[PDB]
Amino acid sequence: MSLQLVKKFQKRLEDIVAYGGTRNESSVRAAFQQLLSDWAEGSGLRLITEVTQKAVAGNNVRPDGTLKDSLQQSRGYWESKDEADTLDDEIQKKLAKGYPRDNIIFEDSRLAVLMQNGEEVQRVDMGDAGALAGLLKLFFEFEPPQVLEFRKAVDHFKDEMPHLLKILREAA
Amino acid sequence: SLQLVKKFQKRLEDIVAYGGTRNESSVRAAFQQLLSDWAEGSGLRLITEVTQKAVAGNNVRPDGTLKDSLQQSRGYWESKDEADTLDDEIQKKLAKGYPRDNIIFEDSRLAVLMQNGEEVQRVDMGDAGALAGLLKLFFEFEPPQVLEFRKAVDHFKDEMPHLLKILREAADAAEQKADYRGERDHFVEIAKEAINPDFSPRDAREMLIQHILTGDLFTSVFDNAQYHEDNNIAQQLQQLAATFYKGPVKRDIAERTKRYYGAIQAAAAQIADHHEKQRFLKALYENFYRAYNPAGAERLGIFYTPGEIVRFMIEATDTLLEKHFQKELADKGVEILDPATGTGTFITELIDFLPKAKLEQKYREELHCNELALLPYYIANLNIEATYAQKMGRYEEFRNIVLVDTLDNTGFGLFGSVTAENLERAKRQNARPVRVIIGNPPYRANQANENDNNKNREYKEIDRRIKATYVAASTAQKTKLYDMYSRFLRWATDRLKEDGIVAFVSNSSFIDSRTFDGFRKEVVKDFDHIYILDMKGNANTSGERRKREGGNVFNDQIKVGVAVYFLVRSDTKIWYHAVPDFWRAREKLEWLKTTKFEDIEFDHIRPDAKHNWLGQVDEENDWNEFLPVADKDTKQAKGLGQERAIFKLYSLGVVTNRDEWVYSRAEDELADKVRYFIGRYNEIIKLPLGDLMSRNWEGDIKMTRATIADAQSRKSYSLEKNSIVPSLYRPFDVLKMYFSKNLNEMQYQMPSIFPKGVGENVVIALSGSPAAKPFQVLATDILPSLDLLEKTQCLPFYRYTMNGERLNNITDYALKAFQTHYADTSISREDIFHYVYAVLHHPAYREKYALNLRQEFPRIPFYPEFGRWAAWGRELMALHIGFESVAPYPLKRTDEPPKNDTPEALALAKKARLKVQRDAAKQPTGAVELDGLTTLAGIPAAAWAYKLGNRSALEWVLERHKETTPKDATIREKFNTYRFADHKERVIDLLARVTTVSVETVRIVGEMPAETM
DNA sequence: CAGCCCATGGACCCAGAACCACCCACCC
DNA sequence: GGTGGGTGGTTCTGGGTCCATGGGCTG
DNA sequence: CAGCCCATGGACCCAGAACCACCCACCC
DNA sequence: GGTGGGTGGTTCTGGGTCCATGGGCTG
């Protein structure tokens, strides 16, 4: 993942605008769609594209792609724009319509913004492989606080098993 | 790949499982990735959601469009929801104008391809093998642009003669400028020491026309104008062209030549794959020479190797490299050299085989090649450089191509000094350690006719080494081992200094030829494993053999036999596999595509004592039974010890080298052709000595080696009137002939058989060795030609010594041996003669000892009766000795008037046809259509079985009475007078008389024993 | 005589909106 | 089975600025 | 040594022959 | 309206020669 996959995306973005003669989002999205999809396959998640979600307002909204788990539970989202728009301006309108913000990569072909827990965690340039590979690591690993607390309780056992084994040995 | 299809099948399952939605928008990503990843390997890219204006002005946006590197749509895709009837939804989209050229409509479970507005295939996406097949079709669809490109390449070939007229005129007008003449003269001198000792102005102007032609096409259809500015050779030749080709002169020839270049340029610009545009390179190569210098094309061997053969050898070389040397073609160290590049096919197909990670090093220092002609050099350098560019992505100059004579650059020197860089490349190549010498060497045994004055060049060193190795070990009278293919094989053996493989495609003569017996002894001593694959195809054959040989693996464009051979040097194991008989060219070429070297079941060949690899006599006969003649019995002086054969002297029929000038049906007509010949000859011997020696005369007469030598010695000729004699040219064809030593190239020992042409001798003429036609024997009382029967060898009954008498040629050794086996002193010489004749007509003898007869003089058995056989041979003899004095078999004559009463229909209706009327089962009906008016009928089926060669006796009297057009210009326009109308009545009688002869001999031969001794 | 007043007309471009194509939810 | 709505693309259409910079004054 | 004999296999091409396409004439 | 010539083009397909020229004699 990381370098290998991101560098293939950089070449694919170039092949799309070269063999297609279009820098339109609807055509250039395939590059980041396949980055997010192939990274997910390795992390036990899948990027399912165009999945309609409902907002608090009741407005149905369809992000470009959602990161679904094995139990059909959304864990992250993605929206691509073209290079011919202001990413920051499209961001307020998107979230105003009722877009999710728990874990969303808003991305134009040149800049990528990760918004986690409602705040912009990182803003990288897609030209820098290592930088993008860093942001995508945080996106694919962001976990809800439920699993964050379970993981912490597993660590508690690693220092509680000795104390527990004493009782069982005393009983044996 | 099936792996790609199998991943789609999994991706689809996960999308409906991890996502929970079967909506088309969500499930389409599985096929989008399949199409996109397949395309990334095929040089195309699936661009998604690209809008296309439909024919009805409306805009349609398919889910995906396959696009080429020139941003040109090559295919389309529209996914639907499984919750619909695909068939119904296809119609809706197609009615809104969705493209129907190459579209994959696809619901999640079923896929439909509509190529050319018609459903080519409908598959289920649960089957991986089926989807992979449907996808292959879609990804390999031939768009209209590539078909139009192919069509225009075919028009360019026929319009090449007219383009070369404009370019010739330009170069002719250039010799009016002193600057061009100066540069031209410097170039000729430079290339008289770099390319060929006899480089002439003609060769220089060909090179200039080639430069200007290639220049235009390389900038317009191949978009590599820089090639010339980076090519060392191109920069030495642009010096010559810069004198005249500039400004108005160039603008004028360009406006005229644009009418030929226009169509090809238009179509080629819409083609991205160089593997499609390399078909134009092949066409320029083969057609330029055919239109400009057909003669130089023969000496260079301008032909292209079909891709299937090239690919096969590259794969089979890798196989034997791993088997005997534990190396691969991609491994560093294996330096591959193509001694004759041509279009560069072998090197460009190696680039496509070698892995990308290793290609860089190989292209830079391990792939090498040589060329002699300029058009081939330029075409190869561009082909090689552009094939590398397509595979790698970057353009690098191939600095391993040399314009040098491979058979002269044996300085391992001024060879290759056209430019300074070319000389470096030549000296560097002659030091490189070459492991593999792959290639298709030029083949040319001899010039076709002496009048061509286009003999093969002499290569002192190679020729001297061939003489010491191949020729010295050959027990043949005629050596054809100075063929250009044999010269390129000697060079290869010597170039491989240590170990390696020489993989070549060449004439299959080496396998079986009386002349290549020395090669078949020397090759086993310099190579350890020899793997021959005979693809047959020899069309210089006739009869059932021609049908067996089949088509030529070179797209049926050459007539010689072809064999792909691999000679490895690590006893000698000779392996041989032959392609099946009665096959076609496409069948043979598809076999090379499908079969891999491992699958071929080669047969171990064990050379015999005469080094014959194929066609070995069965050593379980009593074949050591007498001998009709032996080279020693003929060369012996006296003594029965050295006289061990039935006959002493034997000769071959007179060969003239000018058959059309010395043979005619009428005595008076011959005399006129012969008078013209002697007439123009006597004017040739008056020319200046310079012109005499340089063979600079108008070639209206046929001057053979002998006549050329006498002319240069100023020896006059005259017409001896008593030299026009009767001669049996072909079976049953008694044409008149001028038997003079001055106008007949080789009379052999026929002066001693038929003294002065008119003598009294009866000869049993047989076939020679090796007979490619069935064994034939005919008795003649008139001088036979060398080609009455294949390589006719005449055995005479008498022998006329000089100032002497007819000494009986049947030896006394034979007389006694026959009067001893049969214990009958009555047996005479004029009885053994007839006995031998009947034995040589015995059907079981000709069948059992066939292989023996094909390779040796026919040894004769000692049949029990003698009397019965001698009688048969007497009856047989008389039938052929007096075939003009037999009883004409009654043949019904039917006559018909011309279609109309116009003078011109009568003309087109007294012209000969002489065709045997056959059936739908191709069996003689028993009727011959002599001309358009007369048709003979009533011929028995038996008469169609006396076959002298591949033709019946009757088919011989029809063939040799047809009005064929003379192949000599003068004879055709001044001495062609034969009209079947004049001889019609004669051929009618001859047919009936020969019908009797044939029907008699089928009976006489049929009453002979069913078994042979 | 160098500051100090007095004109006077300028070789585009980009946000609203319409509307369109396509597919998904939504009635029907 | 349309229908409206979500999303992205593709035409039209409408509608309008501060400020350079030569010349005449002018005390 | 030049002046006789003796071989020996040869880098295609092209005339019918369908068999179409188109369409005038000929029945139907 | 088919239907067979008339005319021209467009593919296959079948089927096959005399004679160069080195080497070995030879006297």
Ligand SMILES: C[S@@+](CC[C@H](N)C(=O)[O-])C[C@H]1O[C@@H](n2cnc3c(N)ncnc32)[C@H](O)[C@@H]1O
């Ligand atoms: C059959 S073509 C090469 C074929 C090549 N395999 C191809 O696929 O195009 C024979 C070529 O050998 C070349 N050649 C190179 N060196 C030669 C030489 N010394 N003598 C004769 N031809 C030579 C000729 O110019 C001619 O183009």
Ligand SMILES: [Ca+2]
């Ligand atoms: Ca988007």
Ligand SMILES: [Ca+2]
């Ligand atoms: Ca679709």
